[PDB]
């Protein structure tokens, strides 16, 4: 349609902005190393400094893009950690279960 | 510590200023080809947003829509403001030109006398 070309352009635009700065968010997160606790403190402290020097559309989208990469990094970080936390518990609890079973006899 | 946090805010400023200007030429062309207006504005954005997300949704497609909607809002804004400013100045100019003629007519002795002669 007359507006359909805009929808196709926004798709191309959106797909180019989607995965362009992936490498440059990668480096900022790997040089902070955050966690579910200290993720909130980090973003609020950066957003103040980023906007203390100026505010516009891109500085806002760059900040929200960082927070989305930060959120993905922090919560993927704990999902695999809880896998390592549950499987560790069953293995440790089991191992002590087999020992407690043979000592009582 | 605040060491990394000064640099990431300095990096986000460059990153943020790059996405302002990189796609900036690309939006102004789409607004040139819609030519939207106060009444048909929201309808355009709502119907484009549906079509844009009918084919897929992700982070980039969302910020691209909001970036377009903010530029769309400014474009209708900037145009309507100067349009109203242009109409205000036309009214005062018409009033003052009307007022000076009504004065000149009175200086010649009324409308029947000025126009009749």
Swiss-Prot record, chain B:
A motif (BH3) lies at residues 8-22. A motif (BH1) lies at residues 51-70. The keyword Secreted does not apply. One of its GO terms (biological process) is positive regulation of apoptotic process. A motif (BH2) lies at residues 103-117. The keyword Transit peptide does not apply. Keywords: Acetylation, Apoptosis, Host-virus interaction, Membrane, Metal-binding, Mitochondrion, Mitochondrion outer membrane, Transmembrane, Transmembrane helix, Zinc. Expressed in a wide variety of tissues, with highest levels in the heart and skeletal muscle. GO terms for molecular function: BH domain binding; channel activity; heat shock protein binding; identical protein binding; metal ion binding; porin activity; protein heterodimerization activity; protein homodimerization activity. It comes from the Eukaryota. GO terms for cellular component: BAK complex; Bcl-2 family protein complex; cytosol; endoplasmic reticulum; mitochondrial outer membrane; mitochondrion; pore complex. Zn(2+) binds at residues 94, 98. It is a single-pass membrane protein. Intact BH3 motif is required by BIK, BID, BAK, BAD and BAX for their pro-apoptotic activity and for their interaction with anti-apoptotic members of the Bcl-2 family. Plays a role in the mitochondrial apoptotic process. Upon arrival of cell death signals, promotes mitochondrial outer membrane (MOM) permeabilization by oligomerizing to form pores within the MOM. This releases apoptogenic factors into the cytosol, including cytochrome c, promoting the activation of caspase 9 which in turn processes and activates the effector caspases. Belongs to the Bcl-2 family. This is Bcl-2 homologous antagonist/killer. It comes from Homo sapiens (Human). The gene is BAK1. The chain holds residues 67 to 183 of 211 of the full protein.
């Amino acid at each position: 349609s007359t507006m359909g070309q805009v929808g196709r352009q926004l798709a191309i635009i959106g797909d180019d902005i989607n995965r362009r700065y992936d490498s440059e968010f990668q480096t900022m997160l790997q040089h902070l190393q955050p966690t579910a606790e200290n993720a909130y403190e980090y973003f609020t402290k950066i957003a103040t400094s980023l906007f203390e020097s100026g505010i516009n559309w891109g500085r806002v989208v760059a900040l929200l893009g960082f927070g989305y990469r930060l959120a993905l990094h922090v919560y993927q970080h704990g999902l695999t950690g809880f896998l390592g936390q549950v499987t560790r518990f069953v293995v440790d609890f089991m191992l002590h279960h087999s020992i407690a079973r043979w000592i009582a006899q």
